[PDB]
Amino acid sequence: HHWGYGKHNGPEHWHKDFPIAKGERQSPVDIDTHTAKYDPSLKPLSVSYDQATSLRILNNGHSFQVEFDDSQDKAVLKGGPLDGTYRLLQFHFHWGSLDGQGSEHTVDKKKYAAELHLVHWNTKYGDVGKALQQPDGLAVLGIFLKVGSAKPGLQKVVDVLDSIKTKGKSADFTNFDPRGLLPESLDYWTYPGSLTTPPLAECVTWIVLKEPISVSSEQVLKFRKLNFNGEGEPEELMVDNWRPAQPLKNRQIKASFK
Ligand SMILES: CCCCNC(=O)c1cc(S(N)(=O)=O)c(Cl)cc1SC1CCCCC1
Ligand SMILES: [Zn+2]
């Protein structure tokens, strides 16, 4: 009876195995755009992904993830609200069964069809397992997806999903450029938060871009064809793999823009 996203094992149940689920800096949150404070001392985000080395794509049973070589500074996030250098580990998505849901963060209670998370770890901690134990260990760049025109840079990901349909399947996935998933603007909101999946560790500086990317209805349909189950098990479509907004508590969301 491991955690997941169903009625019997979904977000309302996670606190029993992961008590931090009810902690003081949980994610995601609703971004109330009128309450976020413009902070003129926030720096522009520096996304340096020119030397990114993608390695593999994996269906982990909760999402799918594209993994990168993070054994040297090849794909790094710096600047913005961060101190020092964060290496890209992997990206993955959360999505819904319908286009009016699927994002984890919300903006003035608006849900997007999906959310992309680019997960990075602070190099000062040496490895991601150590970074998970630190309040400034991770930084996640979150990007909303709306349905409209296709995102050309997402198509190589979509096209290989059939080969990783079920839990535990992986494929080689080299030469993928994550720059092709970014919107034009790097304007963002930021707040201190957590993983949105177990173990829900409170180690994340969230950087959520204000501009969504557009994907097509056919791209998100391919996400919804993936399975939570492993091969040869009863089919359970991987949809609605999102945690809903958690209490902001004693936190301020800061905007990089006016
Ligand atoms: C048990 C893993 C289930 C799937 N979760 C993730 O892949 C994941 C999601 C987020 S999120 N939705 O906040 O961006 C983040 Cl920040 C880190 C990780 S992978 C991380 C898990 C703990 C061990 C180190 C890698
Ligand atoms: Zn995520």
Residue numbers in the entry: 3 to 260
Sentences from the study reporting this entry:
The discovery of the catalyst responsible for the reaction between carbon dioxide and bicarbonate came with the isolation of carbonic anhydrase (CA, EC4.2.1.1.) from bovine blood in 1932. This enzyme is essential for accelerating the conversion of carbon dioxide to bicarbonate ions and protons, increasing the rate up to a million-fold. The cone-shaped active site has a depth of about 15 Å, with the catalytic zinc located at the base and coordinated by three histidine residues. The enzyme core comprises a ten-stranded β sheet surrounded by seven right-handed α helices. Humans have 15 α-CA isozymes that regulate pH and fluid balance, and they are involved in various physiological and pathological processes.
In this article, we performed correlation analysis between several new crystal structures and the thermodynamics of binding of two groups of compounds, fluorinated (VD series) and chlorinated (EA series) benzenesulfonamides. Here, we describe CA II and CA IX recognition details of two structurally highly similar sulfonamide compounds, EA3-3 and EA5-3. Crystallization of CA IX is rather challenging and thus we used a mimic of CA IX, called chimeric CA IX (chCA IX). The chimeric protein is a multiple mutant of CA II, where six amino acids in the active site of CA II are replaced by the amino acids present in CA IX at the same positions. We have previously demonstrated that such chimeric protein mimics actual CA IX to a rather good approximation. CA IX is the CA isozyme that has direct relevance to cancer – its expression is induced in hypoxia under the control of HIF-1. In tumors, CA IX helps cancer cells survive under hypoxic conditions, while in healthy tissues, its expression is limited to the gastrointestinal tract. The main class of CA inhibitors is the compounds bearing the primary sulfonamide functional group. Such compounds bind to CA isozymes by making a coordination bond between the negatively charged sulfonamide amino group nitrogen and the Zn2+ ion. The sulfonamide amino group made the coordination bond with the Zn2+ ion in all cases. Therefore, despite the relatively similar recognition mode via the coordination bond, the compound’s exact chemical structure significantly influenced the affinity.
